[PDB]
Amino acid sequence: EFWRQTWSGPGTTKRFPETVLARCVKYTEIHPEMRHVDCQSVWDAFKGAFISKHPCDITEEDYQPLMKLGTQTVPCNKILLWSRIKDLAHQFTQVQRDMFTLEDTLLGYLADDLTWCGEFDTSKINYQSCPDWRKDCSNNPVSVFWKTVSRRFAEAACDVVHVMLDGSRSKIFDKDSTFGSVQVHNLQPEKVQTLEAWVIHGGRDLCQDPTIKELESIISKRNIQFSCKNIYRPDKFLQCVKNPEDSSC
Numbered sequence: 441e442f443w444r445q446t447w448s449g450p451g452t453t454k455r456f457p458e459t460v461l462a463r464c465v466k467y468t469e470i471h472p473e474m475r476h477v478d479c480q481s482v483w484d485a486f487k488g489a490f491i492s493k494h495p496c497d498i499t500e501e502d503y504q505p506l507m508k509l510g511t512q513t514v515p516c517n518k519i520l521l522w523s524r525i526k527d528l529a530h531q532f533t534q535v536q537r538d539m540f541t542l543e544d545t546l547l548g549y550l551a552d553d554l555t556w557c558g559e560f561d562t563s564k565i566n567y568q569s570c571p572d573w574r575k576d577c578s579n580n581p582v583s584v585f586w587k588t589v590s591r592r593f594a595e596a597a598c599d600v601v602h603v604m605l606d607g608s609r610s611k612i613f614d615k616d617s618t619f620g621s622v623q624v625h626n627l628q629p630e631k632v633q634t635l636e637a638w639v640i641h642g643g644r645d646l647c648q649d650p651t652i653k654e655l656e657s658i659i660s661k662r663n664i665q666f667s668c669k670n671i672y673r674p675d676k677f678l679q680c681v682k683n684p685e686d687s688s689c
């Protein structure tokens with residue numbers, strides 16, 4: 441009973457319902473084009489996807505009603521994907537405002553950095569613990585949400601799709617990541633012309649790393665062109681993105 445926790449992962453973020461709703465209201469303020477959205481209806485559809493459901497039995501179809509309410513057209517040629525480098529990816533698009541990560545969409549913005557799950561056959565949100573993808577089960581409310589939106593976002597991309605990767609990390613490209621397992625394989629060779637990776641540094645040429653060639657090989661088999669660039673000083677990269685007038689760029 442009370443000393444045991446159902447799951448190995450963090451529980452639902454405190455004030456999750458209030459937070460999702462306040463994020464919806466704020467998003468539709470910052471982004472007028474999405475003001476048709478009823479923030480209450482969005483929350484109801486979000487809640488409906490996982491509440492009373494066993495948190496190891498969530499399906500992509502459970503999120504379909506939410507996907508419909510959060511339908512949004514982003515410019516397909518202005519998409520930035522990323523893996524393991526969320527912070528710089530987000531700061532980039534805070535400055536370069538015509539480019540979008542998933543978290544710059546209504547849906548990604550609502551869910552970013554949050555955890556949520558319900559309990560089997562009750563209407564209570566679980567605030568103690570939620571499944572962990574690796575230790576408990578993969579088909580949980582959080583992982584199934586991200587898989588579904590990450591797929592759709594990738595499918596919508598066109599032209600030169602950019603991906604930010606973490607060069608200071610163990611595996612720069614990881615086939616098992618969300619980017620590697622969901623997004624890479626849902627890039628449409630008809631729409632997408634090129635995938636260009638920006639390998640960021642944290643302290644040589646990293647575009648020759650084995651895993652980068654693995655990625656090169658994978659994208660080539662999909663009949664998309666591959667390109668790669670090092671970013672040797674991410675600090676300077678951001679400064680030059682903020683002020684492209686500056687000469688030392």
Ligand SMILES: Nc1ncnc2c1ncn2[C@@H]1O[C@H](COP(=O)(O)OP(=O)([O-])OC[C@H]2O[C@@H]([n+]3cccc(C(=O)O)c3)[C@H](O)[C@@H]2O)[C@@H](O)[C@H]1OP(=O)(O)O
Pocket residue numbers: 520521522523524525526541542543551552553554573574583586590616617618619620621
């Ligand atoms: N196979 C998997 N099954 C379940 N969960 C997984 C899996 N792989 C990664 N994740 C989780 O997604 C997050 C992204 O970090 P990565 O370093 O995993 O980066 P990534 O997974 O390549 O990045 C996500 C891409 O999709 C989007 N995404 C995905 C997930 C979360 C969020 C967010 O903003 O909150 C965003 C984002 O737009 C980006 O282009 C981590 O919390 C991962 O959990 P773990 O490895 O810590 O257990």
